[PDB]
Amino acid sequence: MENFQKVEKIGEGTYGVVYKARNKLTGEVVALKKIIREISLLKELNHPNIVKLLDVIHTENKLYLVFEFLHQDLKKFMDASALTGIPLPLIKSYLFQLLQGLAFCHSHRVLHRDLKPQNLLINTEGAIKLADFGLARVTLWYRAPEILLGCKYYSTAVDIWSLGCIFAEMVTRRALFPGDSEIDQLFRIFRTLGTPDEVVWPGVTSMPDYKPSFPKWARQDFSKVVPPLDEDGRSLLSQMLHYDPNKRISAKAALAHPFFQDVTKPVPHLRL
Numbered sequence: 001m002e003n004f005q006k007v008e009k010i011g012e013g014t015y016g017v018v019y020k021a022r023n024k025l026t027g028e029v030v031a032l033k034k035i036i037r038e039i040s041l042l043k044e045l046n047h048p049n050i051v052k053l054l055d056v057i058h059t060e061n062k063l064y065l066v067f068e069f070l071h072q073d074l075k076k077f078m079d080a081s082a083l084t085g086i087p088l089p090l091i092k093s094y095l096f097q098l099l100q101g102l103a104f105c106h107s108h109r110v111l112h113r114d115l116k117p118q119n120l121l122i123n124t125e126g127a128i129k130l131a132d133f134g135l136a137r138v139t140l141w142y143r144a145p146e147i148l149l150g151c152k153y154y155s156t157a158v159d160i161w162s163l164g165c166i167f168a169e170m171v172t173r174r175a176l177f178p179g180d181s182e183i184d185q186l187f188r189i190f191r192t193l194g195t196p197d198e199v200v201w202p203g204v205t206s207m208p209d210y211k212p213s214f215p216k217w218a219r220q221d222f223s224k225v226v227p228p229l230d231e232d233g234r235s236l237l238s239q240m241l242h243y244d245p246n247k248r249i250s251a252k253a254a255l256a257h258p259f260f261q262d263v264t265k266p267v268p269h270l271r272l
């Protein structure tokens with residue numbers, strides 16, 4: 001609506017375009033996403049670790065979603081600190097907060113479906129928030145195997161897999177499974193975690209796109225996956241990456257993992 005004055009074009013959203021804008025009325029700086037019963041619900045999905053949806057505006061087939069604005073995203077923060085790496089305390093805080101945000105959405109039956117560094121926003125207060133939450137109901141690097149294998153009614157576990165991939169990237173400073181096509185993505189997972197079978201994943205051989213012809217890769221020792229992360233960390237990650245969605249640790253249980261024992265809330269140094 002006319003009540004806004006775009007300040008600059010942030011980025012291309014997986015649904016449309018996102019602008020930094022200012023409300024003439026409230027005088028508040030916001031994020032204007034250019035694109036119903038599904039978004040409305042999302043307005044009541046409030047939590048400190050979930051980017052707030054301020055308003056929804058529908059007009060002439062044009063849909064606008066107004067969100068609180070944050071200055072930087074996790075992807076941009078990882079590139080600018082890839083030579084020095086993000087300190088463990090911060091990685092642990094971020095992971096602990098993300099799991100909090102997730103534990104809340106899930107407790108309410110809302111999946112993100114497409115978590116990735118770009119949609120994780122941070123501020124100078126050391127807080128990180130989930131962006132584009134619930135909007136699903138091009139990167140494939142954070143997509144869970146069951147999704148890739150054709151499961152149509154996948155669960156909250158898919159978000160856990162994505163966060164697990166992200167957690168691994170912060171530690172090593174390189175994408176875990178950098179797929180450039182669905183088959184390449186699926187095979188990259190297989191080559192690290194081992195081709196799944198009925199032993200570790202009951203039901204895998206009956207899934208829509210599974211094939212008795214998939215190559216049989218061995219599971220690589222986990223200590224070569226994300227070094228030099230400590231045991232509490234490798235233990236948590238392995239559970240976030242279990243093949244079977246029913247076995248994959250939930251957000252709630254992960255917050256109880258010993259890894260968060262010494263969890264604090266440091267602040268990164270932003271250079272807005």
Ligand SMILES: Cc1cc(N2CCCS2(=O)=O)c2oc(-c3ccc(O)c(O)c3)c(O)c(=O)c2c1
Pocket residue numbers: 010011012013014018019031033051065067068069070071072073118119121131132133135
């Ligand atoms: C520096 C930067 C980059 C991005 N973006 C990261 C990738 C999408 S974006 O370019 O908007 C971004 O997205 C969203 C956002 C929230 C919810 C949603 O549904 C969106 O579509 C976008 C914000 O509130 C925000 O403050 C912000 C800031």
